[model samples]
Target: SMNPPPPETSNPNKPKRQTNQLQYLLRVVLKTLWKHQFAWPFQQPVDAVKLNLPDYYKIIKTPMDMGTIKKRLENNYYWNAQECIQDFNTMFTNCYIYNKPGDDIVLMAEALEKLFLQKINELPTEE
Candidate 1:
């Protein structure tokens, strides 16, 4: 919630299309950070999980191993293992659950990041 959602702010008085442009940007930002570069961590197909609900749920409930990978990255950026899990959840949710496919998510995310970066880059940096 504390995370910035661009489309919802700033241009509130703009026309619907312009406002929607903001939402589109937000969706893209989330998608890019999550989707394109990485597929869902669940290597097994969703159908396989659906076939055996209880067993699938059990596996889903268990913690996934992300130890070594975490050691290589910014540990402070993420609090715990569940933070990794939740980040994945948000990524996938942005795709299938949010009606945006993986590739589309990437494009949108990149666009939004570029937009933000462009804005920031325009500001004079300290000497």
Candidate 2:
């Protein structure tokens, strides 16, 4: 009888396989934001695992154009992107005004965007 190959073992110098840190964290936050979708809010968690870390990391690290991101953030519920922005502003403002904890959603979004932008800027422009 043939025995199946043993599962890969960890090495000290080289790290075990893993997902992109920022993307995994960001996905968790986004899933919370769209929770109305229910228990299976985020699609195919396995897909995230299947991606090559370096390739997936670069995708999130790419600079997201502000205009493009803003357009995507705005929804039909708001008259315009400006309106959506204002509502988000008010949402945070209300959180502060009421001395509420702001749900950490704001923190996650800011951190994710900042990290991504930092990665984008780290790339050499002349190349």
Candidate 3:
């Protein structure tokens, strides 16, 4: 006969199935978040150097993103829903800090359009 397990602690190995099930549900929720257009920038980790994020690393010491959260979930780093949820909310906080005012999205499109026009003007007509 098999012996019964003792009382569980913070992270119990006894209830593996339940823990995995919770992760599966959260992953499904994550997929929904992935599809949403608003969370676009937060989909991947910030490319601090190449992306012209001069002060991002300095400002956000412990940078977090949706992709990172997924990794953490898969690794079983987060023990419960609250912890995982907090990470998601924390990502928004990071965005809030980085995007205080002067909406950059509009500015980005405008800049690209201006560059394209300038490049086209420089192109000489064929002989």
Candidate 4:
């Protein structure tokens, strides 16, 4: 019966429209990443045993993938869009760690990262 959220550290005056804007933008980015051609390797969680990547779990403790992000959003587990963006970054870093540079999966992760950045640059400037 322990409460889990972190202690307040910053200004907590979040406005409703700002939160809604970020949430909508996150949803759009998630969909586009899933549909990307280089998305297959990261669409779902990696099966370490099936993929014969026994060291994968040891190397990447926190695994993130598109499907996992989707479910978290659906369940309202995400506190903010920045959390989802960090998840995407986590996913990419995991790939880079477990897979060598120039590996197909690594390249895919890079491509998806590029697309993600493009999407993020569309952030709203209005209040």
**Sort order, lDDT high to low:** 4, 3, 1, 2
Compare the candidates by lDDT and give the number of the best one.
4
TM-score-best of 1 and 3: 3
lDDT of 2 by residue, 42-102 (tens): 2212122343333332233222222322233332222232333333333333323323354
For model 4 the TM-score comes to: 0.78
- lDDT agreement with native, every candidate: 0.34, 0.31, 0.54, 0.71
Candidate 1 residue pairs that clash: 7-22, 28-108, 28-109
| Model 4: per-residue Cα lDDT at residue 51 | 79
Error of 3 at 77 (Å): 2.1
| Worst window of 10 by summed lDDT in candidate 2 | 39-48
lDDT of 4 by residue, 30-96 (tens): 8888888888877768877677777777777777887777766655565567776788889999889
Off by over 4 Å in 4: 1-18, 125-127
**Candidate 3 — which residues are off by over 4 angstroms?**
1-21, 102-127
Error of 2 at 8 (Å): 54
Instruction: Report the C-alpha lDDT of model 3 over 1-127, residue by residue, as the tens digit.
Output: 2222311223535232326434543455565566654556666677766677777767876566777776666556654555655666566666667765548743432343344344334433322
Error of 3 at 30 (Å): 0.8
CA-only RMSD, every prediction: 15.7, 19.6, 18.5, 7.0
On residues 1-127, what C-alpha lDDT tens digit does candidate 1 reach at each position? 1211211112334333223223322344233433433333322223323444344333333322122123212223332333333443433343344233556645544444454444333433222
Global local distance difference test of model 2: 0.31
